[PDB]
Amino acid sequence: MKIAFIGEAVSGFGGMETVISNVIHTFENSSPKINCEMFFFCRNDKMDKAWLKEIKYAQSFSNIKLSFLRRAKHVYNFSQWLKETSPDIVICIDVISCLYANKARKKSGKHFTIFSWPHFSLDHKKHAECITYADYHLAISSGIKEQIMARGISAQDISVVYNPVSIKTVIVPPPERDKPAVFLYVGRLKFEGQKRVKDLFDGLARTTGEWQLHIIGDGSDFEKCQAYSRELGIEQRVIWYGWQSAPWQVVQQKIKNVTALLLTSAFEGFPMTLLEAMSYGIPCISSDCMSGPRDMIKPGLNGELYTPGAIDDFVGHLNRVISGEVKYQHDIIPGTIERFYDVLYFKNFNNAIFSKL
Incomplete structure (x- = not known):
């Protein structure tokens, strides 16, 4: 053939x-x-x-x-x-x-x-x-x-x-007890349009509890994003890495502990980043957008989905992961994407x- x-x-x-x-x-x-x-x-x-x-x-x-x-x-x-x-x-x-x-x-x-x-x-x-x-x-x-x-x-x-996606032989663990929650964003920066970093920022500003956001990526909207952060008064909780050839190396070597990867997109061709995260045992909180975070994320097991535009739901999801009301077991998350x-x-x-x- x-x-x-x-x-x-x-x-x-x-x-x-x-x-x-x-x-x-x-x-x-x-x-x-x-x-x-x-x-x-x-x-x-x-x-x-x-x-x-x-x-x-x-x-x-x-x-x-x-x-x-x-x-x-x-x-x-x-x-x-x-x-x-x-x-x-x-x-x-x-x-x-x-x-x-x-x-x-x-x-x-x-x-x-x-x-x-x-x-x-x-x-x-x-x-x-x-x-x-x-x-x-x-x-x-x-x-x-x-x-x-x-x-x-x-x-x-x-x-x-x-x-x-490739099988990984390392797990990125959560932060230790009584350390701030550590959120990760990996991708090209767009304030609105496809990526809606604005939504990410707004939801994080609304959350209860101590958190830090690590952003790997850049784009024309970088400055705008920074400005927005400043406006929101979250600038001291956001760490910017710019463009990185190996984001997962950065994650391993510099960040070390991650609560969740966040994705707030209006739409996606295919969110490989989510897959990558899950392969390292990192839970993912994503918009339920076309397409298909809903094919990868199993609510309550390896992260959460929120209805497009439902920032309150996103905030709720964030709050539960920060408090431990919902716990994702990093050691079993790689097994939740078997078919990928x-x-x-x-x-x-x-x-x-x-x-x-």
């Missing part, structure tokens, strides 16, 4: 890329080999090729300003590629690519199964309706599955495959693919 992984050109530095490469490496090492190639739809050659080290790939280039012509070109090139290569399976890492795959199948006269495998909420990205051009669907979240179903797709044609760990994840993924054939 041969699998083609196809998509629009990406930066080459994202988590998605990493997951893809990992999957391909796992596949081409399953049997003697299963054989994986990639095909990219590009307006330029800006994509970094580092992540495509041991990956066989081809590219379709079109910078025609009329989208219709561009898409026509893309479909043509991918048909040609199909004719050349003859894949058994085509997996589309974005929604437009499903369209391309379907048209190209018709054009090329080649027989293969098309799987969707989007890495972002359909409702927060362009070309959502193109999802319907795939035969079957690989959903990284329940929210994505829901979105897919809303466009008329049967639940039986969608497998929730989640996303992978590399090997099991890949098993599930493979099953989702070959179960539909």
